[PDB]
Amino acid sequence: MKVMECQTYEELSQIAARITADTIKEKPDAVLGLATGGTPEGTYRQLIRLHQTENLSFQNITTVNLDEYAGLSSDDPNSYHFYMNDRFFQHIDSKPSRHFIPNGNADDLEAECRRYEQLVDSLGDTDIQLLGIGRNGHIGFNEPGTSFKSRTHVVTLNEQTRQANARYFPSIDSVPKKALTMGIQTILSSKRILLLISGKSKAEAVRKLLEGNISEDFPASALHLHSDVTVLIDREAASLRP
Ligand SMILES: O=C(CO)[C@@H](O)[C@H](O)[C@H](O)COP(=O)(O)O
Known part of the structure; x- marks a missing residue:
């Protein structure tokens, strides 16, 4: 695992966007695994900037997202479909039909997860997979206790x-109880992993990641088993490192 401390969130975002851009330009038909949440917001903003400042093209890319909340439609402002469209897809020259995200509004969520996993395999797996980390070490919505062999599946979110x-x-009552997520094995099949970590809320998770105990109780520890993992950590997130 390569760990890179970044001075600021803005520097983390610059470096992440550059690494992602590298993947896109080396392989214009790259398959990018993407993440939502607060952490990658700056990365998407900087990718869009590079679209302007460097004439970076997304025309032949395919993307697969980690996760989607169960029970939300694509037009719901809290869906990850909406997030990806708003933060990224609307601003780039991709082919829209080549952006894939699990359908949290499917009638049979188990079947949706099986089809999604099958799709990821058919794409040739990901060329790079962007991740964030939960306060508890989750990756995607693979919560503590998830098998490292897990595939895309329906999960009950931890409190x-x-x-x-x-x-x-x-409101708290609107937060979904379940989600669909790529599994740990789905993530580990990526050619390259880019884990982004920012802010004081993640400092305990950073400490556990860097201490190197490998176990299902801390999902991100599965990444110690991958051959090409880069972890970008800002100063606030690095504050409790061992
Ligand atoms: O699967 C994802 C993102 O698609 C989640 O694992 C988040 O990366 C994690 O919950 C951190 O979220 P933020 O702290 O970035 O909001």
């Missing part, structure tokens, strides 16, 4: 995850 994400919802 800590609902507590963390409540900031984005009108």
Whole structure:
């Protein structure tokens, strides 16, 4: 694992956007695994900037997202479909039909997860997979206790995850209880992983990640088993490192 301390969130975002841009330009038909949440917001903003300042093209890219909340339609402002469209897809010259995200509003969520996993395989897996980290070490919505062999599946969100994400919802009662997520094995199949970590809320998770104990109780520890992981950590997130 390569760990890079960044002075600021803005520097983390610059470096992340550059690494993602590198993947896109080396392989214009790259498959990018993407993430939502607060952490990658700056990365998407900087990618869009590079679209202007460097004439960076997204025309032949395919993307797959980690996760989607169960029970939300694509037009719901709290869906990850909406997030990706608003923060990214609307601003780039991609082919819209090549952006894939699990359908949290499907009638049979188990079947949706099986089809999604099958799609990711058919794409040739991801060329790069962007990740964030939960306060509890989750990756995607693979909560503590998830098998490292897990594939895309329906999960019941831990209360800590609902507590963390409540900031984005009108009320605590609107925060979904379940989600669809790429599994740990789905993530580990990527050619390259880029884990982004920002802010004091993640400092305990950073400490656990860097201490290097490998176990299902801390999902992100699965990344110690991958051959090409880069972890970008800002100063605030690095404050409790061992
Ligand atoms: O799957 C995802 C993102 O698609 C989640 O694992 C988040 O990365 C994590 O919950 C951190 O969220 P933020 O702190 O970035 O809001």
